[PDB]
Amino acid sequence: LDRADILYNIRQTSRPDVIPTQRDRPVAVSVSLKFINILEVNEITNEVDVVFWQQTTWSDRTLAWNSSHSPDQVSVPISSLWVPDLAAYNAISKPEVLTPQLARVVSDGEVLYMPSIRQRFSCDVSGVDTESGATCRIKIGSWTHHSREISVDPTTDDSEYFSQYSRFEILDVTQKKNSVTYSCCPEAYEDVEVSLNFRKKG
Amino acid sequence: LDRADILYNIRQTSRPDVIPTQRDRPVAVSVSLKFINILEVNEITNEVDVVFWQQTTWSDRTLAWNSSHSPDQVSVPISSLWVPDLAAYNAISKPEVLTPQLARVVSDGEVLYMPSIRQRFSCDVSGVDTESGATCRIKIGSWTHHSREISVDPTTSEYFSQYSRFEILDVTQKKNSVTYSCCPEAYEDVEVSLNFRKKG
Amino acid sequence: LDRADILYNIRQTSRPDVIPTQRDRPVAVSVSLKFINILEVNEITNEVDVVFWQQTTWSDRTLAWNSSHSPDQVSVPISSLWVPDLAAYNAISKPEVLTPQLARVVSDGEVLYMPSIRQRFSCDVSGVDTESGATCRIKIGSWTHHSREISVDPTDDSEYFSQYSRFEILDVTQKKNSVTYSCCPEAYEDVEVSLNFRKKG
Amino acid sequence: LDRADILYNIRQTSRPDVIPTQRDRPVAVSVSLKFINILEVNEITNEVDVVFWQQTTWSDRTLAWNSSHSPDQVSVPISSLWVPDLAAYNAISKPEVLTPQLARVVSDGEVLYMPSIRQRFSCDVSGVDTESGATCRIKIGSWTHHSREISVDPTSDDSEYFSQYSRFEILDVTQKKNSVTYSCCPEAYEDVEVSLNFRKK
Amino acid sequence: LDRADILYNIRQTSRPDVIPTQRDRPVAVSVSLKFINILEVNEITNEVDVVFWQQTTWSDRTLAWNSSHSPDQVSVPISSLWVPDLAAYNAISKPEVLTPQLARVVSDGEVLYMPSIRQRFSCDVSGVDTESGATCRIKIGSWTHHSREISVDPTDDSEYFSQYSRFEILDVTQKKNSVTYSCCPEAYEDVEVSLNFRKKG
């Protein structure tokens, strides 16, 4: 199989509307934010404008091919794939995707999608001009799929990709799993809570 | 039936342009706003910028399937479904949808669509910096369907951002029925009264 | 005929690119602006930001159906219909459509399209802070169809206007105008809408 | 032939990706800007925000029909036509098209496309608040076609339809042809240079 | 072969989702930025707004045709072609493409795509108001293809820079990097562009 055949097969049999659940178990989605820049911070309004790489991984076995005498991986437009319906609960702007909308698909059906996103958030900016800094929390989960359909887990240096030219610096990033049941609904929804501890440079 | 079969059936037969009336009775649409944030307020221009979850429910029997060895619910792109043509009569910006445009469909044909929307409104901002606060009224109804085709009803604060400069004192959501001079038919609306103020 | 059949018939035989002229007569398009809000006014730059409902009516006999055991009217996405190519000659921003892009079609082929539009205009803002107020003129007509293909005709001025605007409406007049350009032998029709408004005391 | 037949024929056989060259000669494109407004000027940054009608004409013989007992002209969405790939070399914003994206096609295959465009330019704003005014030069040519594929030529008062309510007034508009060969490339590229002499009122 | 036949063949067979690797050797992409304008600089936030032509070249042998009695080159919409998935690693806005999205294809399968882009970057603006100026570095490479699939290589200093900018260019250097990240076993190639510029004053 060459690249042309694999990408033809995916384009022709891609059900992008269809969550790829196996034997009624949830799709395991891994999510990790790599912070690249903090552009605007407002301690009065408690708003931040951030650029991050949203590292997103999951398995879709319908994509898989035999890798013997074939590529191990191909680049696929996300319009030809199912992608998790992830949303940031405290976003106050739409995600601005800065990068080409391609994912990497491995021959075993693993998908890696990592867009660069600029987005604005409502979060705690208090203490940004102090030594211990501000802690801005961002919650990301499936908008419509509960824990029996999608599970979200943080992935396996917090400032390795962060811009040296930002007015801000990162003290710490922690990424932890939450499972929440709301009054509306009988089912639990999973989320990754990302805590960005940052401060103004002196 | 698996998810793949249900979503194929819905894509092939859903008729997104066709209001799903039963026996010439109106489609009963429920609408409730959950306020998440108040971002900008201008007492001079009487304008507010708000983020809310627009909880929207209705029945479309053409979507229904036998649930007996099948999923009870699926996620469906709204482009594959009929959705009510709701508009806010006092909006001064287009709705900015912040979330994926998917609805939940139950095997009995019940649809739940709850987008997160950022939108600007013309409303009474007077008293925002006082103890009793401002009361901003938002009217939402069908743009083109009168009360014999679509009825809009409220369902009868909790998720408001603790980090807003503002706080919510009260939200009331009440039904209105309006006849305009132009037109013989009544149009239903939910009137949402947001009583809010600047934090001390 | 039920709604599903009518909307199927319209979607399948809709020629949205084809002006529905009858026997070589112009399509009569009626246009009336209902002002809802005046958001920003600049007396230095002579610019206004306005929200209005653009009530637009015309007949397309290709849409018609026998109403006798059928709905009298349906809601149709404008992407399935011919719509007049109206433009505001003094607009300085694109029309921001705030409402769902549906028109109402009557069984006789009458169409009503009424979008809520926010748009910015170049017009006379002088006198806005005086008792007699400013008069801002907005000209709306077909961008590409002359008077033998499209005629544009006008149909309480403050019945829909926001009580919470910084401005108030004194008067709205909507009158028919005709432009002939040097380039072209044909006249292009427009509705001229005169918005007399002022800052509230 | 009626309008419906002509627009069907154009939709079914228009190759919008195919430049309509005749007998290996260039497509002759005429371009004339009609200035409507000057909205924002910055003498520090040397930037202007302008609204203009970009009158664009060319021949496409593949569109032609016999006009005997048929319309002389139809309105066609530009998505169904080849359009020249014109760009303003000193634009610093994308063209904001304010009008419906329809062209006029004449039965002989002449196309007229005249969008209303709002766009920002890098140009000489020095002297805008003096009697002799500023001269802002805008160059428009094909982005990808050299002079053997596309020629651009200028076409009465270019300023006749300028807004009386602008803070600015037009002193003079000149529109002249340039043909440039760059070091990169063996072929010549044509452009129309438009010089807008304007000042604050 | 005429233009119509070549563009039909490309539209029918191009495979825009398929990287045109030969015998599992990388696609050689050449990238060179031609700086046209520096619009906004902020020494506090270390941000610049720049307009540049992104000269991009590569070979796709599936596009090739016999040039005997045929055009040597055609203009092709990039939606009908594979294009490299290039991104600027320090961009803080999406690329605003100011030009028509057409590439030039030579009969041997060479592609030239040169969009005019306005984009904002995070980079070192310190020293912009001094004689030696600021040096802003921009890194451009494939977002998803490593060095075994795409290689990126640099190809007259600042001849097309706007004379009306508040800034002037002292020097542009464009050098190749090959980077291995901790996450990933493969090396990713990038062109690093160093823009040495200062305020004219």
Ligand SMILES: *[C@@H]1O[C@H](CO)[C@@H](O[C@@H]2O[C@H](CO)[C@@H](O)[C@H](O)[C@H]2NC(C)=O)[C@H](O)[C@H]1NC(C)=O
């Ligand atoms: C729908 O079409 C029917 C079928 O021909 C029309 O019914 C006729 O109407 C005429 C004229 O009024 C009567 O005198 C005939 O007896 C009817 N014939 C039948 C077979 O019913 C009907 O008029 C049409 N409906 C409308 C609203 O025009």
Ligand SMILES: O=C1CC2(CCNCC2)Oc2ccc(Br)cc21
């Ligand atoms: O109806 C829902 C579903 C949802 C929507 C947001 N994503 C998780 C699932 O959560 C809710 C939260 C609050 C309310 Br009220 C309703 C709801």
Ligand SMILES: O=C1CC2(CCNCC2)Oc2ccc(Br)cc21
């Ligand atoms: O024709 C209508 C119907 C509509 C359109 C949008 N609002 C709900 C239903 O209401 C009208 C309001 C004013 C005028 Br005039 C005409 C109309």
Ligand SMILES: O=C1CC2(CCNCC2)Oc2ccc(Br)cc21
């Ligand atoms: O060629 C035309 C026709 C048109 C163009 C768009 N609006 C109405 C019809 O009107 C013109 C206006 C001015 C000039 Br100059 C040419 C023209």
Ligand SMILES: O=C1CC2(CCNCC2)Oc2ccc(Br)cc21
């Ligand atoms: O340097 C060039 C070459 C180019 C780039 C656009 N595509 C055709 C070839 O044409 C130019 C047009 C204007 C200017 Br200034 C420079 C140039």
Ligand SMILES: *[C@@H]1O[C@H](CO)[C@@H](O)[C@H](O)[C@H]1NC(C)=O
């Ligand atoms: C993959 O292909 C090789 C080569 O034909 C074969 O030996 C291997 O077992 C295959 N596995 C499959 C088809 O699952």
Ligand SMILES: *[C@@H]1O[C@H](CO)[C@@H](O)[C@H](O)[C@H]1NC(C)=O
């Ligand atoms: C191309 O066409 C010419 C003349 O028609 C001929 O010399 C040649 O064989 C053709 N094929 C190739 C691959 O050059």
